[PDB]
Amino acid sequence: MRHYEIVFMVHPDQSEQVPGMIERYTAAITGAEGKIHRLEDWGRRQLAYPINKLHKAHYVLMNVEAPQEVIDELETTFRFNDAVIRSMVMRTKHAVTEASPMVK
Amino acid sequence: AVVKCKPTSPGRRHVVKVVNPELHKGKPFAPLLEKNSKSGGRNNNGRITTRHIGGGHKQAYRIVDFKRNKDGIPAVVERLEYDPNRSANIALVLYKDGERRYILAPKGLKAGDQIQSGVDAAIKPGNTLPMRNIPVGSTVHNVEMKPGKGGQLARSAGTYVQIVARDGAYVTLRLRSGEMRKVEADCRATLGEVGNAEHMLRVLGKAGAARWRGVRPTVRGTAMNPVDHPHGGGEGRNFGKHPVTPWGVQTKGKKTRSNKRTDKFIVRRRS
Amino acid sequence: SRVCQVTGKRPVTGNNRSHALNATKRRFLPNLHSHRFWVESEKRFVTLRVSAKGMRVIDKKGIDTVLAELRARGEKY
Amino acid sequence: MQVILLDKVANLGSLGDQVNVKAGYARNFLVPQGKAVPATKKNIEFFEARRAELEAKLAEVLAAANARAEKINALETVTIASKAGDEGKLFGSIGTRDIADAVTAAGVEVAKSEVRLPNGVLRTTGEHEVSFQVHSEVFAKVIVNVVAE
RNA sequence: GUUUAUUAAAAACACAGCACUGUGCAAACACGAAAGUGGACGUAUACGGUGUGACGCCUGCCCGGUGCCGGAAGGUUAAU
Ligand SMILES: [Mg+2]
Ligand SMILES: [Mg+2]
Ligand SMILES: [Mg+2]
Ligand SMILES: [Mg+2]
Ligand SMILES: [Mg+2]
Ligand SMILES: [Mg+2]
Ligand SMILES: [Mg+2]
Ligand SMILES: [Mg+2]
Ligand SMILES: [Mg+2]
Ligand SMILES: [Mg+2]
Ligand SMILES: [Mg+2]
Ligand SMILES: [Mg+2]
Ligand SMILES: [Mg+2]
Ligand SMILES: [Mg+2]
Ligand SMILES: [Mg+2]
Ligand SMILES: [Mg+2]
Ligand SMILES: [Mg+2]
Numbered sequence: 131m132r133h134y135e136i137v138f139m140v141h142p143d144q145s146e147q148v149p150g151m152i153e154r155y156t157a158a159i160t161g162a163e164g165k166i167h168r169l170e171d172w173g174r175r176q177l178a179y180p181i182n183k184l185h186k187a188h189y190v191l192m193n194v195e196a197p198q199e200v201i202d203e204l205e206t207t208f209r210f211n212d213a214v215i216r217s218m219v220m221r222t223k224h225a226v227t228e229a230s231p232m233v234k
Numbered sequence: 235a236v237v238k239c240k241p242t243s244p245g246r247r248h249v250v251k252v253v254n255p256e257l258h259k260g261k262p263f264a265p266l267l268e269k270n271s272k273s274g275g276r277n278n279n280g281r282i283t284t285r286h287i288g289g290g291h292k293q294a295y296r297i298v299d300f301k302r303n304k305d306g307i308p309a310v311v312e313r314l315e316y317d318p319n320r321s322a323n324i325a326l327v328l329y330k331d332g333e334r335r336y337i338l339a340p341k342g343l344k345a346g347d348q349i350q351s352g353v354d355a356a357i358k359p360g361n362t363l364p365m366r367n368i369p370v371g372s373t374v375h376n377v378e379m380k381p382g383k384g385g386q387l388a389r390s391a392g393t394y395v396q397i398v399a400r401d402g403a404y405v406t407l408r409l410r411s412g413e414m415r416k417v418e419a420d421c422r423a424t425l426g427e428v429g430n431a432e433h434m435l436r437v438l439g440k441a442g443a444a445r446w447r448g449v450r451p452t453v454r455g456t457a458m459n460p461v462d463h464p465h466g467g468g469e470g471r472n473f474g475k476h477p478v479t480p481w482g483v484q485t486k487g488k489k490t491r492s493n494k495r496t497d498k499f500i501v502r503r504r505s
Numbered sequence: 506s507r508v509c510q511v512t513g514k515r516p517v518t519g520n521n522r523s524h525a526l527n528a529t530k531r532r533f534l535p536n537l538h539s540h541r542f543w544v545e546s547e548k549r550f551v552t553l554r555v556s557a558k559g560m561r562v563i564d565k566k567g568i569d570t571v572l573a574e575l576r577a578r579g580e581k582y
Numbered sequence: 583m584q585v586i587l588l589d590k591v592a593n594l595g596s597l598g599d600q601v602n603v604k605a606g607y608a609r610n611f612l613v614p615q616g617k618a619v620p621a622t623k624k625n626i627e628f629f630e631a632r633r634a635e636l637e638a639k640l641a642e643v644l645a646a647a648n649a650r651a652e653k654i655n656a657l658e659t660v661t662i663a664s665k666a667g668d669e670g671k672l673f674g675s676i677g678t679r680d681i682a683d684a685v686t687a688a689g690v691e692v693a694k695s696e697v698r699l700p701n702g703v704l705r706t707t708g709e710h711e712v713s714f715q716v717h718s719e720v721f722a723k724v725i726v727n728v729v730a731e
Numbered sequence: 732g733u734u735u736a737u738u739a740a741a742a743a744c745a746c747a748g749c750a751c752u753g754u755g756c757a758a759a760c761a762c763g764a765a766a767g768u769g770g771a772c773g774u775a776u777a778c779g780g781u782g783u784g785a786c787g788c789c790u791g792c793c794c795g796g797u798g799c800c801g802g803a804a805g806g807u808u809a810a811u
Contacts, residue, residue, distance in 0.1 A: 147669040154668070210357060210369055213669060248747065248785065270772080275761095277769035284770045284779075295772070321776060350793090353673055354665075379756080385774095386756065394778045400761040411775050412756060434776040439785095441732070441746040451733090451745050454782065465781085476798055477781050479760080485780050486752055487799040490759055500755080504775090507765090516764095532764080543614035564583070564605060564620070 131164070131197040133222040136204075139181075142174055144213040148188055151213065153189035155192065158204060158221050164196030167225045182215055195225055236435050245283065249439030252432055254323070256344065258313045261479035262296060263326055266336055270295035270319065273449070290448025293318040299335040300376060300384035302362040302422055305352030307331060311360075313345050321391035323430050338376055338389060339429040351422075359426030365405045366419040370397050375428045377407070378421035392431035395423075406501060455480065509535055510580060511559030511571055542568050551582055583608045584621040586629055591617060592718070597641060598634045600626075644712060648717050651690045655714075658725045660684050666707045666730035675703045676728060681712055685724065704728055 140148055152169065159166055172189035181187070194201070201219065209218035239249040275287030288453055296317050309327040312334070317324045325339040327349060328348075337349070340359045349360035355366055364381075368374060373394040376385035388395045399406035404416045438444055456473050458466030464478050477486045507516050513533040520528040541550040546569060555563070561562045563571055575582055583605045588725045590596040591612070594603070600621050603612065605624075613634035619625050662684055665673040678697035698713040707728055714722040 144669070150669055211669075244785085245747085273767065273769065273771085277762055277767090279768075281762050281769090282802095283768075285761085285768080286779095297772095319771095322771070329803050354667075387774070389774050390777050393774085407755095409755060409775080410777095411755070413775090415755060431776080437778095438747060444747075452780095453744070455780090456782080457744060473782085479780055481761080483760090483780085484752095484799065486782090487754075489800080490753055491755095493758085494753095495757085496755080505756090524724070534764090545616075560609075564609065567620075567622075 131195060132201075133225055134194045134196065134201055135220040135222045135226070136192045136201075136217070137220075138190055138192075138208055138217040139215045140190065141213050141215055142184070142186045142188050143201060145188045147213060148190065151211075152190060152192075155204065155207075158200060158207075159194050159196050162196055162200040164194060165225070166202065167193040167195065167227050168229070168233060169193070170230055172230075187215060191230060193222070193226055221232055236432060239439070245440035245442070247439070248330065248436045248437055249443075252430075252436045253431070256314050257323065258315045258326075261335070262294070262315055263334060266297045267332070268297065273343060282504065285450050286450045287448060288450045289445055291318070291446055295319055296324060296336055299337050300386075300389075301382065302337070302351050302385070303382075303425070304333070304335075304378070306350070306354065308348050308350045309335075311343060311345055311347045311349060314339055314343075320389070321430060321433050322389065322428050323391075332449050336362060338385075338424070340375070340426040341429050341431060342423065349385055357425060360424070362422050362424045364420050365397060365417070365423050366400070368397060368425070370400055370405075371426055372397055372425065374423035374425055376422075377426040378419065378423065379417060381418060381422070383419040385424065388428060391428065391433035394427040398425075407502075412504040416499045416501060487497065507534055507537055508554075508557035509537055509559050510553050510575065510582065511555045511562055513555050516557065537551060544568055544572070585612065585618045586621045586625065587618050588611075589617050589641065593602065597637060598630070645717065645720070648720060652714070652720060652722045654715050655685070655689050655722050655724060657689060660712075660724060660726040661729050662726065662731045663729050667730075670707045672705050672707045672728065675705060677702065681726065 140151070148171065152171075156166055156169070168191070170191040172191065174186050175189050177185055177187055205217070205219060208214050235249045235253050235255075237253050239246045239251065241247040270293050272288065272290070272292075275282050275284040277283045290437050296315075296319055298317075298320075307329050308330040312326045312328050315324050315326055315336075323339045324336045325343060326334060327337055328334050342359050343349075347360060348357075349362075350356070352361040353363055355361035355363045357369070357372075362376070362396040365374070365377075373396050375388040375394050377387035377395050378384060379386050387407070393410045395410060397405055398408050398414070400419060403419055405419050407417055409415055444451075455463040455465035456468070456471070460467040463480050464475065464482055465473065476484060478484055483490075514537075516535065517533045519531055519570065521531045522528055526570070537554055538557065538560075539552055539554050540560065542563065543549075544551055544567050551568070551572070553559075572578055583603045584600055585603055585608050587595055587597055587599045587601070595601045603699075608618060608620065613620065619629065660681070662676055662680065664676055664680075667673055678699060679694040681697045681699075682692050682694040696714055696716055698715050704710050704726075707730055709727040710724060712724050712726050714724070716722055
């Protein structure tokens, strides 16, 4: 449908709940007959600057080929969850599959 | 939709109606009605306590759910109705088990939507959940002051209250007057602004339209004799004195709040 | 009625005397307070609309002595 | 307010002590909780000849009634299957009485006034610790696991 | 539209509108020694008070005096 690139930033004390969040989000996409192309946890990572009075965050990259209606449902899940701090969804021209330069 | 009336007569020259075509064009729901007898502003002593109240059209009282206790059970909105008792429109809702109740209609609510109270309710305009479950920075109305007491804040036609902070047991509110007040974090609140936001755009147009609403005319104090009012008297128009009440209390500027019980709950006054 | 149940105090009338000795009639109200007293024998609380003088009497005589007097007076509590 | 004590109170005296207190402290707290008797000379001869050691017998059987009950509360798990949201974020909180309801169901028949909590809400879904005040002095702790329903 | 029943119907009062100000709810306020009641089974798009008086164009300068609001360092100052 519409290729999106989703990266979100988890509160680092909620790093344990991260694979529980990813499986729900994949089941949101694949349950809505969307594709998921790569899915790359980046772990805890030192922030460039302290967002929200704290210095580290847990990064997750996720590439998604879903219809635009369920992504807008997915964005509200990032908005009201307090575990995720920042979320960025970026529309992509195609489906990307190659590993990240920092997964390397 | 505001409708300017065409000037076919003076008294219709300046009338702006507020026409909402979504209101129910029928009788209200009969089990939820009860008698609302008029008072004339007179207490059990028969004396006029508050002036200028009297007359007006007969009004039946609509029992409105402010406590909003049916948790978990979803409810669909049957129709929107006119309420003479208040400035905001009310919504007749139908729970799944067959109970009908009246709530205050929020802004974007229309006939056929689903609402639901309780803690596990979603966050859409219409749900009612305790403010430790509502995210900080959202606009809510029908706000309780005490848990389970019923909603008391932001009930008039276009009002709302923002939730600006939370420190454990309390949330800090931005009331519609601009006053910052602490409320316990277990008090219920209803999401979204309350509905009839264009209520303040009406203009009654003629003197009789205030008598329809039971507002008797106000004689201004300087038009009296000195036995009647402190402002009264004079040979011509004389007002050489500071503006007071009919009981001699300064009005232009003098504060009157004397509640030392609730001063711990007020963060900042209105500006 | 502003009457202490223990001591029988009552609003008396007197005068406000000014500096120019102008007399206007006033009242002297007793310092009444509703207080729950633990009766240890009957194992319950008893509310008495009692003045602060009467609370000093209950602290001296004991609540059992005073409630004997209130029944001997014939007063509900 | 001269008063004789029926139990040791943490800042003024032990059993059998005639210590000046304020009037509101005896009249509202000490006497209505059975902790003190006002020092009437009829009550002193009532107390000092007989109950200076008779109540010392009754004070030991109270601490022995605790030390039997407090000792067996080392099972150190309380599974409260309350409703919760996902990834933490408990639906409905657990207060002191709900903790008291479940330690009743496993161990001592305990009351709601025995539970001591730093938060009180226990909003975090997972395991927690709960301190006790089964005596005025002798305290117990039980690890409590709040479990999603 | 209202008004001096019985010498004054008017330019007087009222009025829709406008503004100032008070008022977070056990509201301000009012009647009540009090309990209570009205405001209101309303909740700041609400309510009370005050001035002005549809609408159109507008509403300038003065805070010294008198009020009101805010201030709390100093001076003064009651019972105790
Ligand atoms: Mg009025
Ligand atoms: Mg007016
Ligand atoms: Mg007038
Ligand atoms: Mg005149
Ligand atoms: Mg006068
Ligand atoms: Mg003149
Ligand atoms: Mg002049
Ligand atoms: Mg005289
Ligand atoms: Mg005429
Ligand atoms: Mg005449
Ligand atoms: Mg005539
Ligand atoms: Mg009242
Ligand atoms: Mg005029
Ligand atoms: Mg001017
Ligand atoms: Mg000035
Ligand atoms: Mg000045
Ligand atoms: Mg001042």
